[PDB]
Amino acid sequence: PLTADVQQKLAELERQSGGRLGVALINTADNSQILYRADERFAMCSTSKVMAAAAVLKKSESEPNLLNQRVEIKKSDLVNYNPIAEKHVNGTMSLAELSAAALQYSDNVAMNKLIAHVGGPASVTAFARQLGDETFRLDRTEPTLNTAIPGDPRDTTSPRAMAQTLRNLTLGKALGDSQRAQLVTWMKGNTTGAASIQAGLPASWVVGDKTGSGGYGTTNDIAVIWPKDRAPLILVTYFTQPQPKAESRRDVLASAAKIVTDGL
Ligand SMILES: *C(=O)C/C=N/[C@H](C(=O)O)C(=O)CCO
């Protein structure tokens, strides 16, 4: 996986941080991968929002507007973490606005609206299947999909599956050129990821990422990364802990990112 003192470094990091670490890096320069527990299941938490927004982008390829469609925001709709959907109670938001809100502020009402709109969690899972992702499963809505209970396969995927899917979505041809560019723009505009993968990368590198967090101190990040003068990287870092109310460890994701981008 590079020696494998990248593997030894990740093993150290995992053990030192006392949780379970999952990493999948794809280097598009030569198609190489660095994998650490990349076939184990992890709770996606808010990183699942990329798949929901992508499912909507894919449907917009056959429903030419779609992104302009308005969605009512109700008082009762508040799950709550929803920093954007609140400024529109008893108003509406477009699907474009809900996508942006879900992806860039991790708005949980926005996620629920995306899920509802494609047909529920099973239809988000079906979109993943149509992409050839056989591992992704979305089972619940916000906020329960973030429980992240050990042994619970609901709302999980593997780092390898999520890295390949994210590659196909942001760089490959899973989406139309227009829709791919929209997804990349949204993720590049993320506001929640400065302390996660980005914290472990040279400051000049451009990152589009989606974080996630949940029970058991689950701390996640999935990213497309353009180091300059370099071919892009896809990096998935998933991290979960054993105590139910463990605190977030976004620094572990930053360290994982440093480790696997070393030599690059
Ligand atoms: C996506 O990762 C955002 C979700 N965070 C969840 C929530 O919906 O409340 C949690 O933080 C659960 C407890 O950490």
Numbering used by the authors: 25 to 288
Provide excerpts from the study.
CTX-M-15, which belongs to hydrolases (EC 3.5.2.6), cleaves lactam carbon–nitrogen amide bonds rapidly, deactivating β-lactam antibiotics. To understand the mechanism of CTX-M-15 activity, we have determined the crystal structures of CTX-M-15 in complex with two specific classes of beta-lactam compounds, desfuroylceftiofur (DFC) and ampicillin, and an inhibitor, clavulanic acid.
The newly formed imine bond in the opened-ring clavulanic acid was in a trans conformation parallelly oriented with the sidechains of Tyr105 and Asn132 but without any significant interaction with those two residues. The sidechains of Glu166 and Asn170 also changed their conformation, approaching closer to the oxygen atom of the newly formed acyloxyl group, which resulted in a hydrogen bond network involving Lys73, Glu166, Asn170, and a crystallographic water molecule. Furthermore, the carboxyl oxygens of clavulanic acid established a hydrogen bond with the sidechain atom of Asn170 and the hydroxyl group of clavulanic acid displayed intramolecular hydrogen bond interactions with its own carbonyl oxygen. The bridged-head nitrogen of clavulanic acid showed a hydrogen bond interaction with the backbone of Ser237. In particular, the sidechain of Ser237 formed a hydrogen bond with the oxygen (O5) of the ring-opened clavulanic acid. The backbone nitrogen atoms of Ser70 and Ser237 created an oxyanion hole via hydrogen bond network with the carbonyl oxygen of acyloxyl group as observed for other acylated β-lactam compounds such as ampicillin and DFC.
